[PDB]
Design a protein around this ligand. Sequence first.
Ligand SMILES: CCCCCCCCCCCCCCCCCC(=O)OC[C@H](COP(=O)([O-])OCC(O)COP(=O)([O-])OC[C@@H](COC(=O)CCCCCCCCCCCCCCCCC)OC(=O)CCCCCCCCCCCCCCCCC)OC(=O)CCCCCCCCCCCCCCCCC
Ligand SMILES: CCCCCCCCCCCCCCCCC[C@@H](O)O[C@H](CO[C@H](O)CCCCCCCCCCCCCCC)COP(=O)(O)OCC[N+](C)(C)C
Ligand SMILES: CCCCCCCCCCCCCCCCC[C@@H](O)O[C@H](CO[C@H](O)CCCCCCCCCCCCCCC)COP(=O)(O)OCC[N+](C)(C)C
Ligand SMILES: CCCCCCCCCCCCCCCCC[C@@H](O)O[C@H](CO[C@H](O)CCCCCCCCCCCCCCC)COP(=O)(O)OCC[N+](C)(C)C
Ligand SMILES: CCCCCCCC/C=C\CCCCCCCC(=O)O[C@H](COC(=O)CCCCCCC/C=C/CCCCCCCC)COP(=O)(O)OCCN
Lengths: 98, 105, 122, 171, 83, 115, 347, 175, 71
Amino acid sequence: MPLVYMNIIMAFAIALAGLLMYRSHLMSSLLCLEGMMLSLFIMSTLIILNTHFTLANMMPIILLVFAACEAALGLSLLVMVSNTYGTDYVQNLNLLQC
Amino acid sequence: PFFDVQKRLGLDLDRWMTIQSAEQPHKIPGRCHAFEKEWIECAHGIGGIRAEKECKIEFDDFVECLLRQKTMKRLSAIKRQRDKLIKEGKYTPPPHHLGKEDPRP
Amino acid sequence: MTMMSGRPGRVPLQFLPNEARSLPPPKLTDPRLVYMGFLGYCSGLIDNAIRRRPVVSAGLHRQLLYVTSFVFFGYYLLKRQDYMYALRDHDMFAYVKSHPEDFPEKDKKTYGEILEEFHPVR
Amino acid sequence: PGIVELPTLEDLKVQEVKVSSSVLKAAAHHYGAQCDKPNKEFMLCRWEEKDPRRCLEEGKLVNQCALDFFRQIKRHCAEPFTEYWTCIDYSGLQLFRHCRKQQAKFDECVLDKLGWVRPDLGELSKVTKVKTDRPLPENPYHSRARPEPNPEAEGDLKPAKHGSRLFFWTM
Amino acid sequence: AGRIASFLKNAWAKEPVLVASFAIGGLAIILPSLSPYTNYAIRINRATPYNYPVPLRDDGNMPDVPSHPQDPQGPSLEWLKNL
Amino acid sequence: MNIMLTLLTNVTLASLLVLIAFWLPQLNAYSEKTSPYECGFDPMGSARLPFSMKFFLVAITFLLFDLEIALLLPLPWASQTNNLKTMLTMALFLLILLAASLAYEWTQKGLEWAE
Amino acid sequence: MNPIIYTTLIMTVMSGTMLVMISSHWLLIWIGFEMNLLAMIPVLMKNFNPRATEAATKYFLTQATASMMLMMAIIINLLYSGQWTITKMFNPVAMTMMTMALAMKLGLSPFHFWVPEVTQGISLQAGLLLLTWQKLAPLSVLCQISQSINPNLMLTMAMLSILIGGWGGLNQTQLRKIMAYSSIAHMGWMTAVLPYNTTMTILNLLIYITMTLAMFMLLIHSSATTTLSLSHTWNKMPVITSLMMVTLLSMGGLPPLSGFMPKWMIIQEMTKNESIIMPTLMAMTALLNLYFYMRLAYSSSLTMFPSTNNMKMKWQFEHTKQMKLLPTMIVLSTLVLPMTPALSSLN
Amino acid sequence: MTMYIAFILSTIFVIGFVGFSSKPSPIYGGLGLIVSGGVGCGIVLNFGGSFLGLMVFLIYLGGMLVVFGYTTAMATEMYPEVWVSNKTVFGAFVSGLMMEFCMVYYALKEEEVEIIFKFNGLGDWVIYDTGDSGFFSEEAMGIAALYSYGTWLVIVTGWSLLIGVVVIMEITRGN
Amino acid sequence: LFQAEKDRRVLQMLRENLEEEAIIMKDVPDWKVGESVFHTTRWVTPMMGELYGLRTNEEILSATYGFIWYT
Ligand SMILES: CCCCCCCCCCCCCCCCCC(=O)OC[C@H](COP(=O)([O-])OCC(O)COP(=O)([O-])OC[C@@H](COC(=O)CCCCCCCCCCCCCCCCC)OC(=O)CCCCCCCCCCCCCCCCC)OC(=O)CCCCCCCCCCCCCCCCC
Ligand SMILES: CCCCCCCCCCCCCCCCC[C@@H](O)O[C@H](CO[C@H](O)CCCCCCCCCCCCCCC)COP(=O)(O)OCC[N+](C)(C)C
Ligand SMILES: CCCCCCCCCCCCCCCCC[C@@H](O)O[C@H](CO[C@H](O)CCCCCCCCCCCCCCC)COP(=O)(O)OCC[N+](C)(C)C
Ligand SMILES: CCCCCCCCCCCCCCCCC[C@@H](O)O[C@H](CO[C@H](O)CCCCCCCCCCCCCCC)COP(=O)(O)OCC[N+](C)(C)C
Ligand SMILES: CCCCCCCC/C=C\CCCCCCCC(=O)O[C@H](COC(=O)CCCCCCC/C=C/CCCCCCCC)COP(=O)(O)OCCN
């Protein structure tokens, strides 16, 4: 595994860690999710191109689709909670406990 | 769990994309078509447990083709020994390894 | 781990292979079938109880359908269970026959030659 | 796990065909029409052996046949051929469609100088047969012996002895 | 018979763009199944030699396969030149 | 290589123009001159307050409709395949489904802005 | 929500689950997971209030993160072996990430935090769907890769799930949180035996599903979501409370009821692999679940709580909507133990 | 080793990921994600996948636009945070940069294994093919095979998109 | 013709690399010169690290990125 594969894996790990830590905004976490999606796309594309897996070339494109379907979902949710609180702070999501 | 509707009906919903040696468009071959074909032929019909131990040679060759780790190690050793021989100066690499070669078609 | 899902020659979604026709079918007076009919009768009684109806005599057609459906499902369930157990025994005996070195027939001593330690209770 | 057999540099020596891409493209059709036989043996050897080290002589014969083809073209009429391939070389994509008059002149020269006929559209893509004395390889993949499969399921089916044998159940 | 006619007139009077778009979409859906040139398009796509044609080994009983490209045997592209 | 040189040249020329703009003239900056502009009077609030978007649902739909162009872009290469019937059927199916998505968004009053 | 839209969303969820369980390609399984989550999100938000919206947001975040690590594990397995088929995961790191992602998808501890919140925030029908149907796809995926699962990590998570569910269910007065903690404990029980025998996993899942269906359908019949609200049911329909107490007894694992059958079948299996400490700890920990079932049984059926005057009016009206499958679910959740050997039909 | 192009691009990709992963005001996070998308697109073209990189870049530029549009509405934060405007953001950014530099140095000078395996450098040019054939683009042919081989994929993806439109409209309904 | 010339060129580059490796690794403890890496004995396409590993940088850049960078 050359430096490129390790750098892409590190990018995915950084995006996942940034998602797992919440500061205030939900939009920043959605941005981290988009970053994870981009890192996965890049790694899959590199792996498929390196081995000349011809059919698998359609795999990353499909990977993109369910990307924004996940994004369009989150943004949608981000609207509604805002309509309840006037802000997208994840602090306000504390009505339900363990 | 796994309800094999594809095998029951012969539908082939996603079995065309599972391996790289299976009917690529314009007959374009994978980088490791021979290795994967050999390993699949070795491991066919003997179960996972038996294939993990008896087809280990073909799988090792396939992984070597896929990642080329041992080849990179060999090349790194070659270039390190070449650098050590050049630093003290008793190698003098040949002219065709420096750009003074008479190329062929 | 799964033991019989990868058995060679297995049809994916058959639920009753043709070889299962070689085994005797369960008798209609099987105690398990009677228990399934009892389960259907209890289901009918509970259905009558929930809807605030006379429990024992509200719907005779409904109770009869309950019992009949339970018995009908139980017949094929018992057939499949018996077939699976027969398959297990068949595979076990075949493996034992095919690997004599792993199941050695050992000559067995009589109790007169074995020395068991005696532990008095006092 | 073994040393790799590589031919010596003397076995790789051959008289190279030193014409440029445009020159080859201009005479490509007549070359495929005239030098088809050694080319087809070489291609069949290459695809059957899957090893460049087992078909070097066929490549040498291909080079020799190409040399004879170009030597005949040079000997009989080379001026129309030069006028055609300079035109082919001018185009950035080396388009046949830009120079049909030079192609016509070259075709008419080769038709009466050597009896050569330019192949029609679709003929050069045909799948042809090869008569060869080279034995068909038996194990081109160098495959090992395949493992013996699990034996079989044989015999008739009998009911389980004493039923399920699960704890206290007698059925 | 008459309800569809009045509906279409009202749609053309109010929303010509939707009528034109639906007509174009319906034509694009229906026409290819009723055209004789789809087979010609398929054959033209099939006749393009993207990769090398690997020659066959003569076992002595292949009359249909040619021995040289200019032999009359094999597929012919005569229909393409006259189309 | 060539494209990298082109991008470098363009960015360098733009940055040089910025440098000439910010280093050639004589600048006299004071507090009143650098204040925000709201047509002569001081702004009431901050320009970093929330700004309601009445077309948010169309913005969400634009993401999926942008994915559909990514799906439909390889059509020129797809039209070269042998299975023209299946290729045409699948392309028409995808376009029909996207048209149905647009129709469902239209009829459910989804293309109309909030008030 | 429009009934046609609700039906097509439900069918899209079930189609995603079906695609997960019928696919031999990892990409198709991932696509099925994405479809299931996408169609599942609006079902949780069927009734609009701040609490339902919050639950959907937490569920979306959790499932999205689990999907991301699922996809990265797939990509790593592809990198170290050019295989797309679902198989024994030639790379251990990819196997670990897949185990973690499926653990969060199921809700195994310590990824259990979202389950009580999501269950409490949504309605009873959405809770039933979440606690019954959403468990099929991850467990179906796990049953295929069990030969490569590291026993230590899976068993640690199963023990943690059992302990955490038993401890959490003790402090709850809301019924949906109790159901969520019971689901966590039962998830631990399912996943404890998975590396050894997947047939026991399937049997445990089926029994848990039937008991959860009976429980949730009884809770829907008597519109109670708290302990005190359920304490009023004895004065309106005693039979519902009696069947509820029998079902709670079955869930606790007391013989000869059905809930004893899976545990009994799991422990035995674990004793064939020289595993004695783990089954003993699991059996001892199930007593906490039994205790917080018994507290509910005491509150609702074995004692009569004070009632209210207006309840008299409710005596004049009947349950208009009938659930056909409820008696069958109750019977299958209580009286099934004598038919234990039928589990041989599951392999 | 040669021209450092792939290595520099991957490093900038990681830097942009750290930049938007420190979670400043979402404007700068979107900027960092845009630059990361462009850099990854260039990385992909450096391996022969021009269409995938352009497509990824093209998809991302517009997704971010929608994200900027939503940030200006619901995540405004009257004092927006930049990487140097807050101690937590700067700490996370510096930690990510320092960790990336240490990993690069450890895997470059020596052969260190972090999680999966080790790396010795040599440049990514070593693992290429030398395959010399083709009058078409292999990546383009593979992507175009979606409409002949991937009928199931097209069906499921189109259904997912239609369901997504229905789902977002149901979610944003409110009431 | 192109196939034949490519085969000869690849074999020549491999043989030149082998004849050099016989010289750099004369005095390494246990190096087998020309030893293969795969267990199988069939032909394996070179990796472009085995053909240009001991050559100047500009040939490496050509053989790696010439087609991609040619515009
Ligand atoms: C190992 C072997 C064992 C296997 C075990 C397998 C698993 C075991 C069971 C798993 C757990 C079951 C959990 C199910 C709970 C369902 C959740 C729910 O809906 O609410 C709960 C529900 C709600 O109660 P509620 O409060 O009274 O309802 C209020 C209303 O819902 C208030 O809402 P509303 O006002 O809007 O009312 C609308 C209402 C009324 O609905 C209507 O209005 C009807 C109008 C129709 C509209 C037409 C639209 C269609 C056009 C769209 C086309 C989309 C195509 C999608 C496909 C895309 C493909 C890519 O619709 C509904 O209520 C729900 C509709 C349900 C339809 C289900 C259709 C099945 C989908 C199957 C898909 C799979 C296909 C293959 C995929 C291939 C792969 C790609 O409560 C119950 O239903 C009682 C529980 C009963 C559950 C079933 C019990 C267990 C199952 C036993 C059956 C046999 C199983 C074994 C079969 C093996 C093969 C023979
Ligand atoms: C509370 C008890 C559980 C309740 C169960 C639900 C009750 C209704 C029964 C469900 C009806 C459907 C069953 C038959 C329809 C078709 C069956 C066929 O299509 O599927 C077969 C499979 O059929 C099932 O295996 C049998 C289902 C029967 C369920 C009953 C067993 C319950 C365990 C013992 C409890 C006693 C129950 C008594 C009932 C009163 C194919 O086998 P296969 O595709 O290769 O297996 C896939 C999984 N593998 C490969 C991983 C193994
Ligand atoms: C068209 C696109 C391509 C253009 C190609 C030409 C590139 C143009 C050059 C880039 C911008 C130049 C702007 C032209 C005006 C000069 C601005 C600057 O260079 O002068 C001063 C820079 O000098 C500083 O005052 C400090 C000078 C000394 C301190 C460090 C310099 C050390 C260098 C050694 C010099 C000694 C002799 C060297 C001989 C080679 C800044 O003074 P300041 O008032 O703020 O800014 C306003 C300038 N005003 C006055 C004209 C309005
Ligand atoms: C049996 C179950 C029936 C009821 C359940 C329905 C739920 C499933 C959804 C629809 C099922 C149909 C999918 C069938 C699999 C498609 C693949 C197979 O059928 O062949 C394809 C045939 O596909 C054809 O285009 C016709 C079928 C496509 C139907 C159009 C889509 C309709 C789907 C509607 C339901 C989906 C959800 C709702 C969306 C609106 C192409 O094969 P072919 O090209 O020969 O050879 C390929 C191999 N090559 C490349 C080497 C040559
Ligand atoms: C078989 C082919 C189908 C597939 C191809 C379709 C191609 C894509 C075209 C459709 C894209 C999406 C269409 C969205 C539908 C819009 C629904 C709608 O709400 O339209 C109404 C209008 O109502 C309508 O639906 C339009 C009229 C009916 C539809 C158009 C005509 C239907 C088809 C007619 C052509 C048939 C074929 C040609 C026959 C030629 C004559 C013999 C809009 O009005 P408002 O915006 O609310 O106005 C507010 C301000 N006053």
